[PDB]
Structure 1
Amino acid sequence: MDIIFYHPTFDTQWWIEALRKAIPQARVRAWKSGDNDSADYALVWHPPVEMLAGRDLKAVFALGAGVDSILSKLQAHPEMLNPSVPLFRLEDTGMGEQMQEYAVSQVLHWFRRFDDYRIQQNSSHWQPLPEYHREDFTIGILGAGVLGSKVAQSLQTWRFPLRCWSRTRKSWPGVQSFAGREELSAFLSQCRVLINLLPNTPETVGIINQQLLEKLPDGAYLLNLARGVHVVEDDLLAALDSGKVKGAMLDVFNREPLPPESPLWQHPRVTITPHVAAITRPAEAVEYISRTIAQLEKGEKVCGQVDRARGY
């Protein structure tokens, strides 16, 4: 078999060699413009149209969890990827644990009032503060997928009340499952902490806006680990300035890098990371891809597949 590989910034030579060793019968090459030779599988991130157009590939693997970029490019360029070609993404491959590390750390940080103690420390002021209680710190996960479930599981360990929101009902024993737009209001009503692990799709753009934020309990917290387009940043700033939202930690933004003129940078209740919440671990990704190709060859059901009609 023949594999073409393309990634705009990863260690391309490292990946080729690691793919060759995991799939020794395979010829792996980096894709460059003009290369119209045969290929069975394409491993891509932000690929140019030309890499895929007209190719009858056995599969394409997007080298990330999110596929909003490749799918929006296919919408604008329907000739890029034949409907015959199955599209896969990276499920977990280390990003699950990475989202658990980020979420658990910051949820506990807020639950233990480290933000308030930092403010008081800035004035050299010693003052024990009242403890928060788990019954008032219900956590809601917007999005209940591969990463959402992982974050829910790790927070349940700490005995926080937990709820999740998705399109379809979930069966997680101690997590209250809300489903659909008709249940979103009820889901938000108790979310002391709101964690966003949704995909970017046309149905979810701008979902974290003024109307959503004002349904939250007072003194709520926002963790945006998904996509910048999910949040209307001026609406968030207004809810931070009114005291509706006590704190927001944001890893993703409508424009990346976040422009220096954004008021989010210096807002006292905002914490910013530069889109680093969860990156695939190359060796786990090479193992996921090699195992998935082997399953495709054997006719075993795989499920890590993108549905172009639903958008994720």
Structure 2
Amino acid sequence: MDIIFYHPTFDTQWWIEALRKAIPQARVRAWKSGDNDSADYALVFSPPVEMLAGRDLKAVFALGAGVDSILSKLQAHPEMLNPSVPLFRLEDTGMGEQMQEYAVSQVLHWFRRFDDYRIQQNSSHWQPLPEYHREDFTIGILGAGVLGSKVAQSLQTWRFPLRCWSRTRKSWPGVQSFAGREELSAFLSQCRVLINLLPNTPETVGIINQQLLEKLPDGAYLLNLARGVHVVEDDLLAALDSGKVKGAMLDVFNREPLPPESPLWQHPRVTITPHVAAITRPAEAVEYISRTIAQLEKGEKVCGQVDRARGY
């Protein structure tokens, strides 16, 4: 088999050698413009149209969890990916654990009021604060997917009440499952902490807006780990200023790098990380890709597959 690889910023030489070692029967090469030699599999991130267009590939692997950019690209250039080509994405490959690290750290951070103590430390002010209680600290997770379930599981360890929201019902014992736009209000009403792990689709763009934020309990916390387009930044700023939202930690934004004029940077109740919540671990991705190719060759079921009509 022949594998073509393309990523704009990763260590291409490392990946290619690791793929050769993991799939010894594969000829693995870096794709450059002009290469129209055959390929059975394409491993891509932000690929050019010319790399995929008119290729009857056996599969394409998107080297990330989110596929919103490939899809919108294929939207603008429908000839980029023939409809017979299955599209795969990275399911977990270390991003589950990284999302758990981020979510558990910050949730405990808010629950133990380290944000308040930091404000007080700024004034050299010593004052113990009343403790919060698990019953008042229900955590709602917006997507209930590969990453959503991982986060939920890690938070169950800490005995927080848990609820998730998705398109289809989930069966997680101890997590109250909400499904559909019609149940979104009920879900929101108890979320002391709202964690966003939705994919970017037309049905979810802008979903965290004034209408959503007003359904939250007062003094809620927003942890946006998914895509910046999910949040209407002005509505968030208004909810922060009214006390509706006590605090927000944001890893993604409508424009990235977040422009320095944005009020989010210097807002006392906002924490910013430069889109680093979860990046794939190359050794785990190489294991996942070679295992998936192997299952494809054996006729076994794989499932980590992107539904291009559904949008994720």
- State the TM-score, normalizing by the size of structure 2: 1.00
C-alpha displacement of 1:20 = 0.3
Q: CA deviation at 1:236?
A: 0.2
Q: Secondary structure at the match of 1:198?
A: coil
CA distance in 2, matches of 1:177, 1:187: 8
> How far apart, in 2, do the equivalents of 1:116 and 1:266 lie?
16
Q: CA deviation at 1:282?
A: 0.0
**What SS is found at the alignment partner of 1:79?**
helix
Structure 1: which 4+ aligned runs deviate by more than 4 Å? none
- Whole-angstrom distance in 1 between the partners of 2:119 and 2:271: 14
Shift of 1:120: 0.6
Structure 2, gaps ≥5 residues long: none
C-alpha displacement of 1:51: 0.3
SS in 2 for 1:214: helix
- Give the deviation of 1:62 after TM superposition: 0.0
Map Cα deviations across residues 178-225 of structure 1 (whole Å, 9 max, x no partner).
Answer: 000000000000000000000000000000000000000000000000
CA distance in 1, matches of 2:311, 2:247: 31
Q: SS in structure 1 opposite 2:78?
A: coil
Distance 1:129 1:256 in 2: 36
Offset of 1:82 from its aligned partner?
0.2
Structure 1 residue 303: Cα displacement: 0.5
Cα distance in 1 for partners of 2:124, 2:267 equals 21
Cα drift, residue 147 of structure 1: 0.2
Distance 2:236 2:49 in 1: 36
- Shift of the alpha carbon at 1:59? 0.1
Q: Distance in 2 between matches of 1:238 and 1:51?
A: 44
**By how many angstroms is 1:284 displaced?**
0.2
Q: Distance in 1 between matches of 2:209 and 2:77?
A: 30
Q: 1:5 offset after TM fit, Å?
A: 0.2
TM-score (norm 1): 1.00
SS at match of 1:247: strand
Alpha-carbon offset, residue 281 of structure 1: 0.1
DSSP 3-state at the match of 1:37: coil
Q: Secondary structure at the match of 1:246?
A: strand
TM superposition shift of 1:267: 0.4
- Count, aligned residues: 312
Q: Secondary structure of the residue that 2:80 maps to in structure 1?
A: coil
Per-residue CA shift, 1:277-299, capped at 9, x if unaligned?
Answer: 00000000000000000000000
Deviation at 1:308, TM superposition (A): 0.3
User: Which residue in the other structure is 1:66 paired with?
Assistant: 66
Deviation at residue 117 of structure 1 after TM alignment:
0.4
Deviations 1:121-154 (A, max 9, x none): 1111111000000000000000000000000000
Shift in Å at residue 36 of structure 1?
Answer: 0.5
Partner of 1:102: 102
Offset at residue 93 of structure 1 (A): 0.1
Counterpart Cα distance in 2 of 1:240 and 1:120: 19
State the alpha-carbon separation in 1 of the partners of residues 112 and 237 from structure 2: 23
Provide the rounded CA distance (Å) in 1 between the counterparts of 2:144 and 2:175: 10
Unaligned runs of 5+ in 1: none
**Structure 2 Cα separation of the partners of residues 295 and 128 of structure 1:** 56
The one-character-per-residue Cα deviations of 1:39-66 (angstroms, maximum 9, x if unpaired) are: 0000000000000000000000000000
Structure 1 SS opposite 2:215: coil
Following TM superposition, by how much is the alpha carbon of 1:100 offset from its aligned partner in structure 2, in angstroms? 0.1
Alpha-carbon offset, residue 253 of structure 1:
0.4
SS class of match (1:234):
helix
Q: Structure 1 CA distance, aligned partners of 2:179 and 2:210?
A: 21
CA deviations on 1:251-274 (whole Å, 9 max, x unpaired) are 000001001111000000000000
How far the C-alpha of 1:80 sits from its partner, in A, is: 0.1
CA drift of 1:14 comes to: 0.3
